[PDB]
Amino acid sequence: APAAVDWRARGAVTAVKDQGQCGSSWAFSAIGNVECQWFLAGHPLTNLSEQMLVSCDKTDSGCSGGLMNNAFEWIVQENNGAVYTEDSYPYASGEGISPPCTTSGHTVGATITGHVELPQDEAQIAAWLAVNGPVAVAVDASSWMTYTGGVMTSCVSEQLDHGVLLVGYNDSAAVPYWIIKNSWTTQWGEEGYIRIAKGSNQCLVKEEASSAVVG
Ligand SMILES: O=C(Nc1nc2ccccc2[nH]1)c1c[nH]nc1-c1ccc(F)cc1
Ligand SMILES: Cc1nn(C)cc1C(=O)Nc1nc2ccccc2[nH]1
């Protein structure tokens, strides 16, 4: 692996989104990861549908919480692999209300065929990420409300409560760090993003890393 990676600069990452008040940090992580994989497959970067998962993924509990791997498993095994575009199934649960499931011909933004889990190794994840693109990970965002910007180093690492998207790292800097895409708009943190120290398992980042697999 290289000294640094940033998939935004390779134009492979969609704009930062806003989950509003809904525990759907997963849907955003899982989907965010798929948006990138679809692009890196050779296709146009399409903004995909988080609402699809909140409403339809029954394995996951909609708004009160979910898990990225269940999404990938659900999409492939219950939804025939289909991920809808956002224009055809837009986010509604911003305020907490999650509509019912639908099928009046939504548009399929991407078709995935599986997913893979990565080891609990920050270095190995970086190895995969550098080659294959943004990785979906779970973290302990207890210490994230207070976040203004900078390389975070004293992150509470006890409870996985939040789902996000790794878009690259930087092993060259004074303090090596992961670059993480977050679903709390762009006012939060560094234009929507956040940098946590790479190597010491900040925020329990290496604990639940996975990525969808296209084609
Ligand atoms: O509730 C969430 N996750 C969760 N915990 C569970 C315990 C028992 C059964 C199902 C469960 N699902 C959740 C809400 N917002 N974000 C996440 C999230 C937390 C961890 C994670 F890895 C991914 C998402
Ligand atoms: C959503 C959600 N569900 N639960 C249980 C907590 C949250 C949450 O913290 N949202 C949130 N915090 C923010 C802090 C700063 C800016 C924007 C912010 N948005």
UniProtKB/Swiss-Prot annotation:
Keywords: Autocatalytic cleavage, Disulfide bond, Glycoprotein, Hydrolase, Protease, Signal, Thiol protease, Zymogen. One of its GO terms (biological process) is proteolysis. Changing residue 64 to G: In clones 1800-2 and 1800-4. It comes from the Eukaryota. One of its GO terms (molecular function) is cysteine-type endopeptidase activity. The keyword Chloroplast does not apply. Disulfide bonds join 22-63, 56-101, 155-203. The active site is at residues 25, 162, 182. The keyword Disulfide bond applies. Glycans are attached at residues 47, 170. Purified cruzipain is able to degrade itself, yielding a complex mixture of small peptides, and a major 25 kDa fragment. Hydrolyzes chromogenic peptides at the carboxyl Arg or Lys; requires at least one more amino acid, preferably Arg, Phe, Val or Leu, between the terminal Arg or Lys and the amino-blocking group. The cysteine protease may play an important role in the development and differentiation of the parasites at several stages of their life cycle. Belongs to the peptidase C1 family. This is Cruzipain. It comes from Trypanosoma cruzi.
